[PDB]
Amino acid sequence: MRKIGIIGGTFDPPHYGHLLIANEVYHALNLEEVWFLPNQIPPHKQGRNITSVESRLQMLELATEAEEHFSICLEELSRKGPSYTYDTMLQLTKKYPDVQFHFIIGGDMVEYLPKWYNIEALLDLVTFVGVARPGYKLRTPYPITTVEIPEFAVSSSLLRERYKEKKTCKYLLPEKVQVYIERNGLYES
């Protein structure tokens, strides 16, 4: 009954881990498509200095450009304040009543779930889909759906650090995103 996947994130920068998953879950659960949901202010990193919304959205667009099963949901970029997932999903559920949402999260977020705002109410609005990530375990008391994928320990923090240190980023994120980053001098490119 209209299965849609949603992968929320800061995407700073978006990389192959995000694309990997998005594709894996899309296929494993036979979803109609996957919506990438960039937050405006990460709800759990409100004090962190992060790349501007404009620069993050551009990088995301470039990462999901030629991927026909991927699109971007601008719901959080359309309202002020911390982007709590519960608020986003309450609104999305009202706007798309015949859609069954599958919220895709990596191992690290799976373990973070008890810290999520209104997690119990949120569990009634979506079906979480947890995917493995190196250094994290799919350990949680909540009713998540797991999806076996070929794990990839790539991360934005590792990427930001490598750009700063002038270290290799080959194979870790799309070429166009790399171009955008170096061109704009992001992360000390």
Ligand X SMILES: Nc1ncnc2c1ncn2[C@@H]1O[C@H](COP(=O)(O)OP(=O)(O)OC[C@H]2O[C@@H]([n+]3cccc(C(=O)O)c3)[C@H](O)[C@@H]2O)[C@@H](O)[C@H]1O
Taking CB under 6 A as the criterion, the residue among 3, 44, 69, 162 binding ligand X is 44
Query: How many CA atoms are closer than 13 Å to the CA of 67, on its beta-carbon side?
Result: 21
Taking CB under 6 A as the criterion, the residue among 145, 146, 155, 189 binding ligand X is 155
70 binds ligand X (CB under 6 A): no
Please give the sequence-ordered ranges of beta strands (E in DSSP) within 33-117, or none if there are none: 33-38, 70-72, 100-106
CA distances from 95 to 17, 35, 37, 40, 117 (A): 29, 15, 15, 20, 21
Least separation in angstroms between CB 82 and ligand X: 8
116 binds ligand X (CB under 6 A): yes
Using DSSP, state whether 180 is helix, strand or coil: helix
Site string for a second copy, 88-117 (x = CB under 8 A): ------------------------------
Taking CB under 8 A as the criterion, the residue among 58, 93, 151, 189 binding a second copy is 151
The interface partner of residue 105, options being a second copy, ligand X, none and the CB cut-off 5 to 8 Å by kind, is: ligand X
155 binds a second copy (CB under 8 A): yes
138 binds a second copy (CB under 8 A): no
35 binds ligand X (CB under 6 A): no
**CA end-to-end span of the chain:** 45
State residue 158 phi and psi, 5-degree precision: -65, -40
Query: How many CA atoms are closer than 13 Å to the CA of 79, on its beta-carbon side?
Result: 13
Chain positions 6 to 45 lying near a second copy, rule: CB under 8 A, are: 16, 19-20, 23-24, 27
**123 contacts 130 by C-beta, under 8 angstroms:** no
Residues that bind ligand X (CB under 6 A): 7-11, 17-18, 37, 39, 42-44, 83-86, 105-106, 108-109, 112, 116-117, 131, 133, 152-156
